[PDB]
Amino acid sequence: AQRVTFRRRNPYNTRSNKIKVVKTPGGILRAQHVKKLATRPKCGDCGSALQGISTLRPRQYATVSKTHKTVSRAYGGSRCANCVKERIIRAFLIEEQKIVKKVVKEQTEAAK
Amino acid sequence: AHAQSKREGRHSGYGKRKGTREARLPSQVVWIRRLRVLRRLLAKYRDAGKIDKHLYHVLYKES
Amino acid sequence: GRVIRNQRKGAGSIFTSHTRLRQGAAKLRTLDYAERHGYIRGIVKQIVHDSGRGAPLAKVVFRDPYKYRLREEIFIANEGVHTGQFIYAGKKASLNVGNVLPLGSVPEGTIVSNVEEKPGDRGALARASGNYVIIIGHNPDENKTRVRLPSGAKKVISSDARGVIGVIAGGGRVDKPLLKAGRAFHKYRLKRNSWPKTRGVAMNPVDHPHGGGNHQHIGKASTISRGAVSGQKAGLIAARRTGLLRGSQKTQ
Amino acid sequence: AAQKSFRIKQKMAKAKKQNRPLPQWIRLRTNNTIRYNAKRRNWRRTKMNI
């Protein structure tokens, strides 16, 4: 039976006008406006929600101790670790092959 | 008083029935229950060794 | 009489393209030092849907050799090109699907797409969901190259003019019955306001060369001259033959 | 309305001061000729047109 009104002058049902019915100490039902939801930040490499990092609407990340926005590794709060794994491996190996590419055709010139 | 009598299988004859059998209780709702329960039984008997996996896995796919 | 429909479309009011959702303009790299003395590598970071386009676009990022920073271009995906793939752009560049090469360097028989008309106009020929061009020969002195377009028309452009190895994606798009009004509805929704089409024969005289009469009939010949003036040209403009095409087609 | 511009609040407020009847002491001056207020206005008879 207890009904309810918007608490702002906007009367329409939009993403920035979400309601939530609530029981106060007064014993009355009341609307409460609800901020849009946070979405998890993502790996800029693989694309997953990148784990260990906290989630809040963007400007709220400036009200937060630096540890909530990072993990303690190379490329911490920015790529998904199995991504880091990958780009370490590929780094090493390609830097190595660079050696195998040079001295090999250093032989080509000498044996031609 | 009525609702109670309902509980005793009263007032439920073809005469007092205006929506279809499907609408009163969705076929699918009935199914999903049943299957969730066969499924949940298998997991028990197998979680106890009362039945082995190779037999379970057949029942599952048969269920 | 009233201004007839085809005239109104030029002042472009409720006609203009529906622009808004579109990945950007597809284009070849600018024709810099690298691409015309050697070649340069990049990765297709993404192939994606352009709206109102048949064929998938291809986001392909490169290094900028005159400033430490990435510069991403927008390609129309040839067939079979894939994310993570390496793409080569240049005169001295190997000849596999997806690379962009000057038409001077591809043996005849080569199949290419999004080709430049003049060199460095960043693509302009066969860009459409399916099409391509065939290099049908070269002339080294005054370095031209001869190609066949999708129209069957053969054309000769300069050899420095680039074009990309392979054929465009989205093949066979037009093979599927549109089936209902809505599909074309949603087709043109993201193109421009050209559908549906009233027949000029269903209008009154005020509206159209064809309008009026107590039966629906064009009433005079519908093959209309070239010299015909604005508001006259409706029907088979400049039509050199007319009627059902009997017999084979294919440019001899 | 219900959420207005100060420009409009004004005209609204100005129009509220003009909405009184004749000050009867004027009725008494020498040569006075103004019987009543002939420029009065009602919210539900003539609209302000902003």
Binding site: - | - | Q46, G130, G170 | -
Partner: protein, 91 residues
């Protein structure tokens, strides 16, 4: 138990459009929705996503391809023509 003698997935369209047309669609619809083998990782997980775009369930590679099917007959001859022509240039 078999539900339709012939119309298959085309059975949504009821009685409409004309049989012939449904056939032309059905052929192509079966092509587009179908699940495809991945050149790269080797699982049958390539599924379409808007005309021209073909992407792997796992391993997340995306190939550009035919509008309703992965490999255009044309394009694939082209793949081979370029093979041929390429070969000439080294050897």
């Amino acid at each position: 138990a078999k539900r339709t003698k012939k119309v298959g997935i085309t059975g949504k369209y009821g009685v409409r459009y004309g049989s012939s047309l449904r056939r032309q669609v059905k052929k192509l619809e079966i092509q587009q929705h179908a699940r495809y083998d991945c050149s790269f990782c080797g699982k049958k997980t390539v599924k379409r996503g808007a005309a021209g775009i073909w992407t792997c369930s796992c391993c997340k590679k995306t190939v550009a391809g035919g509008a309703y099917t992965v490999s255009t007959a044309a394009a694939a001859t082209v793949r081979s023509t370029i093979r041929r022509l390429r070969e000439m240039v080294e050897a």
